[PDB]
């Protein structure tokens, strides 16, 4: 069994590979989520994952897809390394105290613990990454930062170190929703297939149940995700609170605006998780043998 150090290193590497592979999906989701906030005089409107990716590439370059990528990698190395490598230690701490099989509640609690700690640790990375992903020279809003470390230095010296933890509570909420929805939905669909005999217990049942659970988690966390992105991206003073941002999104843009960038979000969640899981298991076994 892999050591906790091997687990942390493997989770960090796997998360970094997944993040670098799926980063354009993240950029597309962010650009779709901040699209209707400020009206644009430009004719460049983003629609769909492919349309958004192509629009960004052709109006502002390939590299603008990977804007804030070092912040995303730092987010992996700290936040996701912790959240994925500590999950088994926490889950053993909970279930093995009484020699228990991992219940749904045990999984929910372990995931909530690891995800909350990871969110708090890596919020600065999330702030910098979102603000770099959302910034453009085309839509009349002046970019504030030239890069990841420039954004770090500017936010730290103009908004305070607390300004690097902006949007933590919406991010915590999104993490709670994603975790609970994914686990509950996965077990519910696994049973639903097993008792209505829709699929038997090879891999495809697990895989289809994972697909539905991921989509349901993305859909349930989409309103919080949109509000989080827009609140984190906003400069100080624009929104007096996170609920203030949500209320303005509701009154000025309607309910569907709470599902902006849902398709890129779901594609990133699914692809990121698949790539990360494959690389993580491979790294754990490949290191832990040698």
């Amino acid at each position: 069994h892999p050591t906790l150090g091997v687990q942390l290193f493997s989770a960090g590497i796997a998360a970094c590979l997944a993040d670098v592979i799926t980063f354009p999906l993240d950029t597309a989701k962010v650009r779709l989520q901040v699209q209707g906030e400020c009206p644009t005089s430009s004719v460049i409107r983003y629609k769909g994952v492919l349309g958004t990716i192509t629009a960004v590439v052709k109006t502002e370059g390939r590299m603008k897809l990977y804007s804030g990528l070092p912040a995303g990698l730092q987010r992996q190395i700290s936040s996701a390394s912790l959240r994925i490598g500590l999950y088994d230690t926490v889950q053993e701490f909970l279930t093995a105290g009484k020699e228990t099989a991992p219940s749904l509640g045990s999984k929910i609690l372990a995931g909530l613990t690891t995800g909350g700690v990871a969110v708090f640790i890596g919020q600065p990375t999330e702030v910098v990454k979102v603000r770099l992903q959302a910034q453009s020279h085309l839509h009349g809003i002046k970019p504030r930062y030239t890069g990841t470390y420039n954004a770090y230095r500017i936010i730290a010296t103009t908004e305070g170190l607390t300004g690097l933890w902006k949007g933590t509570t919406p991010n915590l909420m999104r993490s709670v929703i994603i975790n609970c929805t994914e686990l509950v939905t996965y077990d519910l669909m696994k049973e639903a297939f097993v008792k209505n005999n829709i699929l038997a217990d090879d891999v495809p049942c697990h895989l289809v149940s994972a697909l539905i659970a991921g989509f349901c988690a993305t859909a349930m966390s989409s309103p919080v995700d949109v509000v989080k992105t827009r609140f984190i991206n906003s400069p100080p003073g624009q929104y007096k609170s996170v609920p203030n941002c949500a209320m303005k999104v509701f009154t000025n843009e309607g309910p569907t605006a709470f599902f902006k960038g849902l398709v890129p979000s779901f594609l990133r969640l699914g692809s990121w998780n698949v790539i990360m899981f494959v690389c993580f298991e491979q790294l754990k076994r490949e290191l832990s043998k040698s």
């Epitope: 400020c38 009206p39 003073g237 624009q238 209320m247 303005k248 509701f250 009154t251 000025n252 843009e253 309607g254 309910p255 605006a257």
Partner: nanobody
Framework: QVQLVESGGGLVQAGGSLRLSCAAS????????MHWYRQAPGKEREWVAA????????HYADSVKGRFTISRDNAKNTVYLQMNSLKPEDTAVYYC??????????????WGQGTQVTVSS
């Protein structure tokens, strides 16, 4: 009970200035973007200006940008349109507008009665 009341319009010479007011009532103006439209007889209603919920951004039609500024005071529930360097082609009825989504497929427009602005030549 959304109610928009525009005032401050009148007859001014070309090159003159005029400040239009919009008293907004029956809704929490602090959550809504506010718009100014104008319509002259023989023309379609024309979007003029838009301002954010707390005035974070303001956008103008190209025909009015630099001459017209949109301003806000949510403590008074008032939206302002300062119109400088007025041209006879600015003669129109100016309308304050709220687009409300809430639980709606499309935004629904609320308008004032409009205030007439005539620019003399």
């Amino acid at each position: 009970q959304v109610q928009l009341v525009e005032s401050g319009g009148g007859l001014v010479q070309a090159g003159g200035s005029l400040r239009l007011s919009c008293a907004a009532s029956g809704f929490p103006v602090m959550y809504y973007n506010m718009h100014w439209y104008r319509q002259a007889p023989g023309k379609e209603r024309e979007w003029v200006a838009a301002i954010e919920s707390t005035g974070w951004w303001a956008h103008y039609a190209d025909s009015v940008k630099g001459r017209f500024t949109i301003s806000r005071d949510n403590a008074k529930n008032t939206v302002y349109l300062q119109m400088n360097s007025l041209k006879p082609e600015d003669t129109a009825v100016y309308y304050c507008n709220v687009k409300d989504f809430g639980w709606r497929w499309e935004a629904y427009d609320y308008w004032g009665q409009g205030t007439q602005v005539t620019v003399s030549s």
